[PDB]
Design a binder for this molecule. Structure first.
Ligand SMILES: O=C(O)C1=CC(O)[C@H](O)[C@H](O[C@H]2[C@H](O)[C@H](O)[C@H](O[C@H]3[C@H](O)[C@H](O)[C@H](O[C@H]4[C@H](O)[C@H](O)[C@H](O)O[C@H]4C(=O)O)O[C@@H]3C(=O)O)O[C@H]2C(=O)O)O1
Length: 232
């Protein structure tokens, strides 16, 4: 059989959040020891693959189920996260294979979090629909209001995509297939300076209906880097 995703990808700085009844989380170490299930597996094309049904368990402050990685700077402490200053970059390649009845899933994020671990709004959501990825960047740190939309069209269900999400000094740069857009979020709302952040990647299903079906998203490559000095 294929190597489990964490015995292939280096997942030593991710934990996995699942859509089972209990919304089980799989630790970095357990991922590295080969955790795999119906929700999380290496497919025949080598992809780390995330499956979640619309009927799945959901986290405390979301109505939607996920099979999704959550960045862990410290694999044993989810309260260790990064800030608006410096350069913080996630790069991935992936594809969305199957959608729920709503036709929408979220395949990558930056989630906000308070210093003490308390939940906060997402800053960036990569929303996939058949034919369109919308890289949404939240305007208000307090979670009110709406998002700035960044549309990348022509990306079909089953198409391989290359993505980057980068924060440098409170500006978000969102890229699909070499097309980069930028949103100055700290410039818009200084309150973002008060929040911390972490990356997410996987399958956050924007459908919780009993008859909604399920979704599958895939990752072929994945990297996160944090730096205090970037070179030309
Ligand atoms: O624009 C929006 O606000 C956005 C659009 C959506 O369609 C969707 O509702 C989205 O959801 C956000 C929101 O912030 C929501 O509260 C939730 O946050 C999660 C978060 O991603 C993460 O999983 C967090 O994990 C916590 C939690 O205590 C878990 O039980 C576990 O122990 O891990 C913790 C940790 O690692 O910090 O849970 C949050 C939660 O639901 O409490 O999802 C957001 C998102 O995924 O974008 O809002």
């Amino acid at each position: 059989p294929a190597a489990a995703p964490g015995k292939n990808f280096d997942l030593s700085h991710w934990k996995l959040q699942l859509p089972d009844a209990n919304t089980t989380e799989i630790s970095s170490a357990n991922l590295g020891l080969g955790y795999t299930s119906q929700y999380f597996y290496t497919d025949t094309d080598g992809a780390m693959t995330f499956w979640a049904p619309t009927t799945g368990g959901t986290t405390a402050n979301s109505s939607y189920p996920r099979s999704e990685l959550r960045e862990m700077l410290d694999p044993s402490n989810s309260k260790v996260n990064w800030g608006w200053q410096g350069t913080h970059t996630m790069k991935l390649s992936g594809k969305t294979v199957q959608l729920p009845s709503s036709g929408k899933i979220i395949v990558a994020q930056i989630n906000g979090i308070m210093d003490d671990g308390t939940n906060a709004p997402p800053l960036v959501k990569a929303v996939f629909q058949d034919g369109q990825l919308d890289m949404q960047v939240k305007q208000n740190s307090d979670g009110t209001g709406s998002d700035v939309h960044n549309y990348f069209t022509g990306i079909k269900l089953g198409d391989l995509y290359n993505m980057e999400i980068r924060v440098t000094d409170g500006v978000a740069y969102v890229t699909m297939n070499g097309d980069t857009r930028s949103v100055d979020f700290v410039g818009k709302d200084a309150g973002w300076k008060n929040l911390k952040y972490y990356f997410k990647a996987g399958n956050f299903v924007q459908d919780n209906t009993s008859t909604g079906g399920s979704a599958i998203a895939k990752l072929y490559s994945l990297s996160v880097s944090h730096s205090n000095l970037e070179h030309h």
